[PDB]
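Customer escalation, tier 2.

The customer says the design service returned an amino acid string that "doesn't look like it belongs to this structure." They asked us to rerun it and document both sides in this ticket. The original structure tokens are below, unchanged.
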């Protein structure tokens, strides 16, 4: 159930108010860009866990009571120069002084530095392990101030430039915060690689789509305004909800491409409307009423494919979904507001600037429709084989391996673990809270320790069961509430985590004690089960909402059911190739990334993104095919006509987003590589294999049941504009007798009753004409009957005139109505006066014919009606009447008033 009255209204109103539209929208988005370049200072790295999970509650209680663990913030490997040993007291004094100096200057950022180097004469075996036994390396630990991840990372980045100079610059920093800042700086590095390699390439792809500077430049400006405004929207959202770092490149990697593609399509159809003969006002309105609603539907489909991600509790996916929605909706709005008004101002000047300014699909579709199974099956089988790698698949958490294997910080983390094994631990934790409020007695701790010892698989370094599950270290920021106690122990093999936790949760607590299972493996496993638990509902919502929207678009039941599984196939094979690439490792040597399990939220994100991409492209294409079959075309020529006029623009937009995605696949953060490669793969599969070979065959074998419209769930076609409506516009419709501009009694559509002055004689002739006694008033249908009679009289007169019959037989029905209109107005001799223009019309030289007709006295005397009729001759459509300014005030009776 459409409403193009709104799109018609907006296509008119955006032309009317084009200046304030461009002003307001450009102002708002550029202001948003100023507002949102500060977005990078208000994003978070938190959002990978399930903050409603038991392990998160365990972590919160632990950090409250015992104090958050700051021992892993920054580890620094110092090694003396000149192959000196770490017991050199001069080098010891120098480096101790340097470190106390850097701590003295940044006490609001650094808590202090720990390590053997502070007390080199000590008994502590753990502290004495902070030096290698060859005594040429020793590490310190530098805890930082801060009570959330973002604040601690900001403090680390504040003190890092001076910390890095300690010991002649030969100090290697690792730990949570060096790794975190490297991982988060990959974002800015990707944005600049985009800025430098993508925008020239997409600019020249734009210029190859339109061989014109201005037409190519408009979608690029739309994309830039989209990026600016979306960063502004995201900075505004950041003041209510946390927004993840990853939301920033998603604005560029997905937002910019789609905004540019929207601009592509709208400028393309504006140019083609101008080429079809319409003026820039009608051109703007039709561009809106067609491509603007295609892009609005495109935005609705992308939002419908991204929203299910909100089912997941990870703030990561939440903020990414918000970024996608803002980018896409702002892109659509801009493309039918700033871009529409810009085109309304420019007009045909969009093509004024050529390249000189410097300072076939139908053969392909038809080859493959008489040979369908020669491509169908030998493509579906290859795609299911491309999915068989998907069964190979694992998931994991963030690691230093997410950086390239030659990354300095990753390498020093790996050398820290190499030189000092056993410090880096990820214990599971039993956190116990007494419901009531009293301290927890040692009997309860011993009980819980025994019940922890019934379960196998926990590390026992000293081979004494009594001394595993030691109490968590308690520091100066813990409340030390005696009603809460934490014990902890690492796993021998972390692959057992998922089950070990599940059995430690299966333990029954002591009487009056609540126990939460926490620790890094618990957080990761709880988040993985979060995603896996709420993934099926995600997929179902995704699928069925996409297919009901394709019900709305195609007006079919078999075509959406086909496109749904075709897109399921695209998604499956894309993910299979992605797993062959990033888990099995094929491509890891050339691209410089480590083969490893995938981030779990990336699964939901990639499902949503690739699914939305494929159904967006399939709707955009087969849309024109359903319109072809609706425009009398056959199925076959329908598939052909659909692929034909779309091909160039589809491949252009595909190439632009492929360029920016290929800019992003070089990122140092492997999650970025995975997502951008999934984009490239799904793109190249959707733009050629499925688009060219799969859909036309599959829709040929579905012969004519490709459109099955059951019940009243299909678009009936509405009132076709006719000559009655045209001249009701041009001559009015009056149901009561009146006097025209000559004082003659007229009724209906310009129907002269009599030249007599007696209104009663006019009433007599109208009573005779209508068949009843009317007292001077008729109904609408009787007026239509009188008009049909007059039209028949005018056509008979035309076919009787040697000067008019040839051109009249020449013309189509709409242009025939234009000629009958001219005859009605001025007589057949008057119309036959236009010898040259009538010949031009006869020769279908619509352009020159319109030009010559506008040079006439007819145009000068009645420019609005003459202009409408001339436009009808040019375009051969009813556009100049279907949408026009209100009404007319001077009523004059026409020639061929028919009497009987
Ligand atoms: C854009 C892509 C780049 C991705 C960058 C990812 C960098 C990875 C850095 C990992 C930092 C982990 O830090 C270790 C911390 O883990 C837990 O606490 C954390 O988990 C809780 C769940 O809510 C929060 O409440 C706490 O605030 C929060 O610190 C422990 O309780 C803390 O004792 C410990 O110190
Ligand atoms: C992915 C990131 C991986 C990063 C791995 C993290 C590396 C972990 C490094 C942590 C070093 C911990 O060691 C430092 C020592 O702190 C505590 O003692 C504190 O109070 C004592 C007073 O009696 C003083 O003597 C100590 O100097 C003082 O630190 C503990 O009681 C010791 O047991 C522990 O040895
Ligand atoms: C628009 C882009 C869409 C991308 C389409 C999907 C293709 C992605 C790239 C897939 C692998 C590309 O090849 C890149 C890799 O080639 C070789 O290895 C491959 O050839 C060896 C023969 O001995 C075998 O041993 C290895 O298993 C095998 O991976 C090199 O050893 C690697 O240095 C390099 O990384
Ligand atoms: C406070 C501010 C709130 C703003 C609210 C904004 C709501 C956004 C929804 C706007 C309604 C737009 O919906 C699109 C509507 O048009 C579709 O067809 C159109 O796309 C086809 C592609 O195939 C072309 O072929 C057709 O020419 C063309 O008519 C379908 O006919 C309708 O089923 C559908 O509903
Ligand atoms: C179908 C159309 C698709 C068009 C796609 C092309 C459009 C955008 C292409 C932009 C290419 C920019 O340059 C590519 C990259 O070269 C090196 O990369 C590094 O990558 C690995 C990471 O460790 C290691 O191999 C080396 O450190 C080093 O090679 C530079 O260090 C990067 O700064 C630079 O970004
Ligand atoms: C109206 C629509 C279109 C026009 S005019 C021109 C060609 O491109 C489309 C727009 C882009 N779209 C592809 C696409 C790209 C990225 C996506 C995505 C979909 O969906 C989910 C997140 O990321 C295909 C159709
Ligand atoms: N509209 C017309 O045909 C005007 N013609 C009149 C004619 O054909 O004799 C004059 C012209 O072509 O300059
Ligand atoms: N706008 C008017 O009513 C006057 N005119 C219309 C015009 O100037 O084009 C008379 C007509 O319709 O033939």
């Amino acid at each position: 159930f459409q409403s193009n009255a709104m799109f018609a209204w907006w296509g008119r109103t955006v032309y009317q108010f084009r200046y304030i539209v461009i002003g307001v929208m450009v102002a708002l988005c550029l202001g948003g860009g100023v507002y949102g370049i500060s977005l990078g200072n208000h994003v978070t790295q938190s959002g990978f866990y399930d903050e409603g999970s038991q392990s998160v509650a365990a972590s919160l209680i632990g950090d409250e009571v015992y104090g958050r663990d700051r021992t892993s913030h920054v580890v620094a490997i110092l090694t003396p120069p000149d192959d000196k040993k770490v017991t050199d007291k001069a080098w010891q004094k120098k480096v101790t002084e340097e470190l106390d100096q850097v701590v003295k200057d940044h006490e609001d950022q650094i808590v202090g530095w720990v390590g053997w180097l502070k007390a080199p004469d000590t008994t502590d075996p753990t502290v004495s392990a902070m030096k290698t036994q060859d005594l040429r390396h020793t590490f310190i630990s530098i805890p930082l101030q801060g009570d959330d991840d973002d604040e601690i990372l900001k403090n680390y980045q504040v003190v890092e430039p001076e910390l890095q100079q300690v010991n002649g610059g030969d100090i290697r920093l690792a730990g949570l915060n060096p790794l975190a800042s490297e991982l988060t700086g990959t974002i800015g590095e990707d944005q600049k690689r985009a800025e430098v390699a993508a925008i020239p390439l997409v600019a020249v792809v734009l210029f190859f789509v339109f061989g014109t500077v201005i037409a190519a430049a408009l979608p690029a400006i739309i994309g830039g305004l989209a990026i600016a405004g979306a960063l502004g929207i995201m900075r505004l959202v950041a003041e209510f909800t946390p927004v993840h770092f990853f939301a920033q490149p998603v604005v560029t990697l997905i937002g910019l491409g789609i905004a540019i593609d929207y601009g592509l399509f709208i400028v393309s159809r504006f140019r083609e409307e101008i080429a079809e003969g319409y003026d820039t006002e009608a051109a703007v309105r039709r561009t809106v009423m067609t491509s603007g609603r295609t892009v609005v539907f495109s935005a609705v489909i992308i939002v419908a494919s991204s929203v299910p991600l909100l089912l997941f509790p990870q703030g990561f996916l939440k903020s990414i979904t918000y970024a996608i929605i803002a980018s896409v909706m702002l892109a659509a709005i801009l493309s039918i507001t700033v871009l529409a008004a810009a085109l309304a101002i420019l007009g045909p000047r969009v093509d004024a600037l050529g390249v000189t300014t410097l300072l076939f699909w139908g053969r392909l579709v038809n080859v493959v429709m008489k040979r369908p199974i020669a491509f169908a099956a030998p493509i579906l089988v290859v795609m299911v084989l491309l999915i068989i790698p998907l069964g190979q698949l694992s998931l994991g958490g963030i690691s230093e391996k997410y950086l390239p294997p030659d990354n300095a910080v990753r390498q020093s983390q790996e050398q820290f673990d190499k030189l000092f094994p056993g410090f880096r631990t990820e214990p599971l934790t039993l956190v116990m809270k007494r419901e009531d409020g009293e301290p927890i007695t040692d009997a309860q701790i011993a009980d819980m320790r025994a019940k922890a010892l019934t379960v196998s698989g926990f590390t026992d370094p000293d081979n004494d069961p009594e001394k595993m599950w030691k109490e968590r270290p308690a520091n100066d920021s813990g409340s030390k509430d005696p009603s809460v106690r934490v014990i902890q122990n690492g796993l021998e093999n972390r692959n057992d985590a998922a089950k070990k936790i599940d059995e430690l949760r299966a333990l029954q607590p002591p009487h009056g004690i609540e126990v939460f299972v926490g620790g890094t493996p618990a957080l990761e496993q709880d988040s993985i089960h979060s995603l896996f638990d709420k993934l099926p509902l995600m997929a179902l919502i995704l699928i069925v909402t996409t297919t009901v929207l394709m019900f709305l678009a195609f007006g079919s039941v078999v075509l959406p059911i086909k496109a749904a599984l075709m897109s399921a196939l695209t998604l499956g094979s894309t993910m299979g190739i992605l797993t062959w690439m990033f888990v099995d490792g094929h491509g890891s040597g050339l691209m410089n990334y480590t083969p490893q399990p995938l981030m779990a939220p990336m699964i939901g994100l990639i499902i949503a993104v690739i699914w939305g991409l494929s159904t967006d492209y399939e709707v955009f294409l087969v849309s024109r095919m359903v319109e072809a079959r609706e425009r009398g075309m056959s199925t076959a020529e329908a598939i052909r006509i659909g692929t034909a006029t779309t091909g160039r623009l589809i491949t252009g937009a595909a190439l632009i987003l492929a360029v920016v995605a290929g800019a992003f696949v070089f990122s140092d953060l492997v999650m970025m590589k995975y997502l951008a490669f999934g984009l490239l793969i799904a793109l190249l599969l959707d733009a050629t294999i499925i688009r060219m070979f799969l859909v036309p065959a599959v829709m040929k074998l579905l012969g004519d049941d490709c459109w099955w419209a059951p019940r009243w769930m299909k678009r009936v076609q509405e009132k076709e504009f006719n000559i009655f409506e045209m001249l009701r516009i041009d001559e009015g419709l009056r149901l009561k007798i009146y006097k025209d501009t000559e004082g003659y009694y007229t009724i209906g559509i310009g129907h002269l009753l009599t030249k007599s002055p007696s209104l009663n004689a006019a009433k007599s002739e109208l009573d005779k004409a209508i068949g009843r006694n009317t007292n001077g008033v008729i109904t609408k249908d009787e007026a239509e009957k009188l008009f049909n009679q007059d039209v028949d009289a005018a056509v008979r007169g035309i076919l009787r005139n040697a000067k008019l019959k040839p051109v009249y037989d020449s013309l189509d029905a709409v242009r025939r109505a234009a000629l009958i209109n001219m005859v009605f107005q001025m007589g057949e001799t008057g119309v036959a006066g236009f010898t040259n223009s009538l010949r031009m019309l006869q020769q279908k030289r619509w352009d020159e014919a319109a030009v010559n007709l506008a040079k006439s006295r007819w145009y000068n005397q009645t420019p609005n009606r003459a202009k409408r009729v001339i436009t009808t001759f040019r375009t051969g459509t009813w556009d100049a009447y279907e949408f026009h300014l209100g009404g007319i005030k001077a009523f004059h009776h026409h020639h061929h008033h028919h009497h009987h």
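Tier 2 assessment: The sequence is consistent with the input. The first strand starts at residue 75 and ends at 78. Residues 193, 197-198, 201, 404, 406, 592, 658-659, 662-663, 666 surround L6T (ligand 5) (CB under 6 Å). Sent an explanation to the customer and offered a walkthrough call.
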